């Protein structure tokens, strides 16, 4: 997984769990412990978090803000993939595939518009009806 | 580049020049030539070509005309949505390897609401000026 990956998946863990052991990080990967292993030290490098004798590892303020950007750039993607139709089994492979290589202003973009379309249902049923004419 | 990445480029050169020369794929792809060489015995096996200079059989030529048009589809969308121009080739090229086909549909069908109602362009602009707030 990419560092981003592993940010992500802390930060989760952290969330849920209240820690993040260095067997969750490996079993929500699926990789094995060394490769996690590796990554801390880069991400400890780079301080994005610290390691504790009594806590394990702890997010720094700069890995708490980014795990909360992945987090939602995550969610916001399942949403709009989820709102404009798309058969929710593929969404989660679809959005684990694109999260990291989007810019910002592709993000905001989907933001607003995911905005567009929750904000009046009507524009739903539009889209849902076009949906039914690309169907033939 | 992905086996996608040599295709969608192997299509695009032959529909440019007529021809797709293994040192056209490797300017196009950043890659040494040796790198195309091995994907191109690769895409042989597959039956995605054939070299007698490289030839798409049937199955290439569908596949790369797919990747054109997500390629083109995901643009368009981007573009839509209004994100800076300058960003959206970056971005589909990142993203457009990793989408389902159901992904790409809907997608599709997001592009024709807004082509088909010059309106609903406009209300999404409107929504792009609050959220800026
Ligand atoms: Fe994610
Ligand atoms: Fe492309």
């Given at each position: 997984?990419?560092?981003?990956?592993?940010?992500?998946?802390?930060?989760?863990?952290?969330?849920e769990?209240?820690?993040?052991?260095?067997?969750?990080?490996?079993?929500?990967?699926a990789?094995?412990?060394?490769?996690?292993?590796?990554?801390?030290?880069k991400?400890?490098?780079?301080?994005?978090?610290?390691?504790?004798?009594?806590?394990?590892?702890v997010?720094?303020?700069?890995?708490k803000?980014?795990?909360?950007?992945?987090?939602?750039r995550?969610?916001?993607?399942?949403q709009?993939?989820?709102?404009?139709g798309v058969?929710?089994?593929?969404?989660?492979?679809?959005?684990?595939?694109?999260?990291?290589?989007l810019?910002?202003?592709s993000?905001?973009?989907?933001?607003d518009?995911?905005?567009?379309?929750?904000?009046?249902?009507?524009?739903?049923?539009?889209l849902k009806?076009?949906?039914?004419?690309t169907?033939?």
């Amino acid at each position: 997984p990419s560092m981003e990956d592993y940010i992500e998946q802390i930060y989760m863990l952290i969330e849920e769990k209240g820690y993040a052991r260095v067997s969750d990080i490996a079993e929500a990967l699926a990789v094995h412990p060394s490769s996690v292993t590796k990554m801390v030290q880069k991400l400890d490098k780079d301080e994005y978090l610290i390691y504790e004798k009594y806590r394990g590892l702890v997010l720094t303020s700069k890995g708490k803000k980014i795990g909360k950007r992945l987090v939602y750039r995550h969610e916001l993607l399942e949403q709009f993939l989820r709102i404009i139709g798309v058969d929710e089994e593929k969404i989660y492979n679809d959005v684990e595939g694109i999260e990291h290589h989007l810019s910002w202003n592709s993000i905001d973009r989907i933001g607003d518009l995911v905005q567009y379309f929750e904000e009046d249902d009507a524009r739903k049923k539009d889209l849902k009806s076009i949906q039914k004419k690309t169907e033939h």
